């Protein structure tokens, strides 16, 4: 079952076993490859493993399955921030903020904190 594999992947993430968790989200994908959350969860694994190219590919797969995904736009913004595409990264982080507000999701100050990091980096490069 893809949901059981997603939950196992979640337990491995909490135990800081990121490649093991990504492999488990891959098993969930094999069982049902039409669920955006598995790609988003694996993209997060890739960011922790510093594999932004593989994280980016998963964000695009997730956005094709769920255009309203807060986490997919957020993780996409983090990839673009790592690649120094500041304008695109800010736009994705801003979209993530907008979708979280619409969906009544509360991640504390995570999204505004991230936008502040991106705007600071955009200014440094323009200076």
């Amino acid at each position: 079952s893809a949901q059981e594999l997603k939950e196992q992947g979640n337990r491995l993430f909490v135990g800081r076993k990121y490649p093991e968790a990504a492999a488990c989200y891959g098993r969930a994908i094999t069982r049902n490859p039409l669920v955006a959350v598995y790609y988003t969860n694996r993209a997060l694994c890739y960011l922790k493993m510093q594999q932004h190219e593989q994280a980016l590919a998963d964000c695009r797969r997730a956005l094709e399955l769920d255009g309203q995904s807060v986490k997919a736009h957020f993780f996409l913004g983090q990839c673009q921030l790592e690649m120094e595409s500041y304008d695109e990264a800010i736009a994705n982080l801003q979209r993530a903020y907008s979708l979280a507000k619409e969906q009544r999701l509360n991640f504390g100050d995570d999204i505004p904190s991230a936008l502040r990091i991106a705007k600071k980096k955009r200014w440094n490069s323009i200076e």
Partner: peptide, 10 residues
């Protein structure tokens, strides 16, 4: 509780 955005959904 894993309430941060840097957490997988689940």
């Amino acid at each position: 509780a894993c309430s941060s955005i840097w957490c997988p959904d689940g």
